[PDB]
Design a protein around this ligand. Sequence first.
Ligand SMILES: O=P(O)(O)Oc1c2c(c(OP(=O)(O)O)c3c1[C@H]1C[C@@H]3c3cc4c(cc31)[C@H]1C[C@@H]4c3ccccc31)[C@H]1C[C@@H]2c2cc3c(cc21)[C@H]1C[C@@H]3c2ccccc21
Ligand SMILES: O=P(O)(O)Oc1c2c(c(OP(=O)(O)O)c3c1[C@H]1C[C@@H]3c3cc4c(cc31)[C@H]1C[C@@H]4c3ccccc31)[C@H]1C[C@@H]2c2cc3c(cc21)[C@H]1C[C@@H]3c2ccccc21
Ligand SMILES: [Cl-]
Ligand SMILES: [Cl-]
Lengths: 228, 228
Amino acid sequence: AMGSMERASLIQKAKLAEQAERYEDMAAFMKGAVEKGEELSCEERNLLSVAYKNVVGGQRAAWRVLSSIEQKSNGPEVREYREKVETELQGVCDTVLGLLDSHLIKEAGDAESRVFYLKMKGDYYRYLAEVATGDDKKRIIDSARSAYQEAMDISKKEMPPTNPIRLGLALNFSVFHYEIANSPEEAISLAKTTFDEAMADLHTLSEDSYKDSTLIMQLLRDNLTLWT
Amino acid sequence: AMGSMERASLIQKAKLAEQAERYEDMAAFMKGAVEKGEELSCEERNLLSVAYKNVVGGQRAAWRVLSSIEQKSNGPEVREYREKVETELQGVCDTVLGLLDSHLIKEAGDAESRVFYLKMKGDYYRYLAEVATGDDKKRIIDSARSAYQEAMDISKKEMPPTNPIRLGLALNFSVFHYEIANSPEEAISLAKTTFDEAMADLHTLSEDSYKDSTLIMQLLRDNLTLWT
Ligand SMILES: O=P(O)(O)Oc1c2c(c(OP(=O)(O)O)c3c1[C@H]1C[C@@H]3c3cc4c(cc31)[C@H]1C[C@@H]4c3ccccc31)[C@H]1C[C@@H]2c2cc3c(cc21)[C@H]1C[C@@H]3c2ccccc21
Ligand SMILES: O=P(O)(O)Oc1c2c(c(OP(=O)(O)O)c3c1[C@H]1C[C@@H]3c3cc4c(cc31)[C@H]1C[C@@H]4c3ccccc31)[C@H]1C[C@@H]2c2cc3c(cc21)[C@H]1C[C@@H]3c2ccccc21
Ligand SMILES: [Cl-]
Ligand SMILES: [Cl-]
């Protein structure tokens, strides 16, 4: 599909699609850059993340609208279209999890790197878990949990509490606890702990993370305001 | 593609896609409802219009970003991607113009109806004209002009000056004069005339057009504030 194009061209074009708000294309350019076989740099990791976040984020919004419209209070058309979109959402999720398993997630790699791709693995299993049901759902919840946890375990050892990759992970794992794992108990603990341990060792905050991590701190709190 | 589905189902689903903001799908459902062969009702005409407006509106925004990025002040990747998107934009435009020619535009029909589909024909030739160049562009400009004019000619005879279909037409034809036909002379005339002839016979304003047509009056003025 993209295999005739040089890796550098695919990356340039991925950057152009972010500016033009073409995230179906951006993701496609980044799927192709991953498949050139080389390890992604820090900037490239984000580019991949943003592309697929928007694609899958738009589908989830659509699914939630349509799923909300299945009232069943007091014809087939609503379910059919919800399923069409649901099926589409899953394909995109399965697509990212493929690239993560077959190319990006490796045992031997940087701490920043390994956590970033594991957080992502938990995110995309989380998105699948929202749409899944029955016996099939339990499996998907535990793969999400498992990937988030290994990511947490590493970040506590290898990263300071003001690190955006660590903070954004904790944010998303709390969201998993509340919306997916039905434990506002655990969700609140992890959120406040993350917020407080960050404020406790705020001296570790650095010039390069200042913007990214103060934003995730706000998000972390907005959630606790919303829950408590 | 959609040919197994009942017309009523396609319409229901088109309405569901507007709510879920899936205008690629909405347009596809409406392309299919048009191809059932039957004349579209007033509500259906809008549904079709909105679907394709958003699809083609998103592509134009992308094209204008990418085309703006061709600086050429003082590699091939920007042009290639602009062309990819340009080619895509044109296919969607050619697609609507097909449905208009082969199904919707008829000699024998309602005044409201005939004008609505001609306005649309001028709109989609306008979108093509923005991306086109050279000898090829002149043709596209004159087809836009020709369709807008026949639409104008009919609306002056058959519709009051407060009518939203008449007002929105005039709005778009002025926009054609300014951005496409390079005549801020004519664009300003038609705009103020539309605004003033509406205010002159404001007694004709009716309960059903009040919202739609006061909005187009604002748009008409915002444009004149912007031009003069
Ligand atoms: O070290 P950088 O990666 O260049 O960080 C800066 C950025 C940006 C900067 O703005 P600039 O276009 O004027 O250069 C800045 C930085 C550094 C330098 C300037 C800036 C300004 C500020 C801070 C860091 C930076 C601290 C103090 C002030 C600030 C406001 C809000 C949160 C954190 C901060 C852009 C680009 C980048 C950035 C990030 C964000 C945002 C905007 C930017 C939006 C979305 C996210 C964000 C978080 C919190 C509030 C608002 C945002
Ligand atoms: O006769 P309707 O088709 O039911 O018109 C109303 C509408 C709506 C109405 O609001 P509602 O949700 O409270 O029922 C109304 C109408 C009729 C009845 C109510 C309304 C209120 C008003 C008018 C007409 C209507 C005149 C006086 C007041 C108004 C404000 C701005 C412009 C024109 C008006 C919704 C649905 C529809 C509507 C249309 C618009 C909008 C919103 C609506 C947005 C986008 C466009 C618009 C134009 C100008 C300003 C704002 C808008
Ligand atoms: Cl469907
Ligand atoms: Cl391209």
